[PDB]
Symmetry: C3
Subunit: 169 residues, 3 copies
């Protein structure tokens, strides 16, 4: 109770850190330096393993700062209780490939990185540095009941079969 | 307690299944065969209805395998307690429409499906087969209090009004 | 217990509202009128502040109606306990910029808005009106333990290091 086991898989790995006392998640550091071109997909290694206890799920999800400023989209990962593998960040550079070329790379602050050597990149390309906080881990309790098949449900709800914007907008 | 009612709506429907003993969600099978072109949006029918009890929400969310390998993006659906309608998978083929043509269709393993007959498809088109696990359902408890309007909050937090990457990166 | 403090920041702000008795979230109204061109990113102000108590997280997430009908993509925001700032909707118009022009704007019902004056817009542009329900807030309890670094985990799980579609599809 009130203790989570964390296993670092390499020297490139870093221990997750909570920002404030009442904050929800633990900021996840990147273990590798990755360059992502427009519309490219990848799984960023963190070299961090956790042992979520039974009755809980981990949500490997994006940070508001990175997601709002950059075209980097992270799909929220559902970390199962007992997953002792490498926590991978399911990421996509969602910037459009307009077939235009630039001489700069973007950082996770959406700013152009200063380089001494001349290089030609695609417009919308991002670079993630090793040891940068690009994601966070929020752990929530879960309900895992036994499924019971029925002909119809025992009670009629006020909601019914209404959905997908059945109310106003 | 510890029992969830599930109602199958057709012969094309399949009962949700949990992968491991300590796993979080129940894998959701597709009830229909759908072909999705680049940048096309659809709501995939599962023909499965559930009865989430009061004080819980269902999260109809993507699987890591499908989402990381394919351009198929699923928006996490919040299933209300008492929604007895058809569970629809809010999906988009997020592949770019580069106006290029191919003779193959992709499966949910991102592999080109072998076909005897010659057909011309758009580059980035996917095909979802009936009875395939493309999504999962994770059920979490919720807090639904009565809202109280105030002039200002009763306590000052260490966080304050800071957000959107107020700390480092 | 069973009470959430809400602070309205302007006259343009509106109090969040729950749709049904057993519904999960509170519908969030937009405080500003915003026009979003293809592939444009923005943070929509709600002028609403909340005081989430310790041990809970708020999920500022999209509604199924808007997300399924429109190209408007909202990233689920994790609202920390004690965040008294303006709740911003992290949004992107994910419609492709095909360099085509139209004389109509889309509403959040994906319908073309009737206008008396002639204007030229980009194809895929959306308009969000002030006082429209574009998002919702679902509050879930969290587990925030102290992190303990270990050489290896105390128990071997049936899952192990398997992930990213290790089972079938
Ligand atoms: O992906 C989804 C999302 C929701 N749903 C169902 C479950 C939920 O009870 C219902 C409506 O969900 P939301 O309240 O989150 N969206 P919205 O507010 O637009 O619909 P409504 O106006 O009917 O509440 O639709 C799905 O079947 N699939
Ligand atoms: O969509 C959002 C997401 C977050 N927020 C607020 C709530 C939260 O308390 C705060 C920061 O959220 P995160 O910690 O998840 N993102 P980040 O770590 O980048 O910001 P910070 O560095 O300030 O913690 O911003 C919004 O208003 N809208
Ligand atoms: O972003 C992610 C998502 C999942 N994972 C891990 C944790 C989880 O226990 C495992 C599989 O998660 P899912 O069950 O949600 N996806 P899928 O059903 O496709 O994989 P599998 O078939 O192995 O269960 O992969 C990550 O490391 N990063
Ligand atoms: Mg943070
Ligand atoms: Mg799974
Ligand atoms: Mg709703
Ligand atoms: Ni999500
Ligand atoms: Ni896109």
């Amino acid at each position: 109770t009130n203790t989570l086991q964390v296993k670092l898989l390499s020297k490139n790995a870093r221990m997750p850190e909570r920002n404030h006392k009442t904050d929800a998640g633990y900021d996840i550091f990147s273990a590798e330096t990755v360059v992502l071109e427009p519309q490219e997909k990848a799984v960023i290694k963190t070299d961090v393993a956790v042992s979520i206890p039974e009755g809980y799920v981990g949500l490997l999800t994006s940070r508001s700062g990175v997601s709002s400023k950059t075209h980097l989209v992270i799909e929220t990962g559902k970390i199962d209780a007992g997953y002792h593998g490498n926590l991978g960040i399911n990421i996509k550079n969602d910037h459009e490939d307009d077939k235009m070329q630039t001489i700069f790379l973007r950082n996770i602050d959406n700013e152009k990185i200063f380089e001494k050597e001349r290089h030609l990149y695609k417009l919308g390309s991002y670079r993630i540095e090793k040891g940068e906080r690009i994601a966070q881990l929020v752990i929530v309790p879960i309900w895992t009941p036994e499924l019971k098949q029925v002909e119809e449900f025992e009670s009629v709800s006020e909601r019914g079969e209404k959905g997908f914007g059945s109310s106003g907008v």
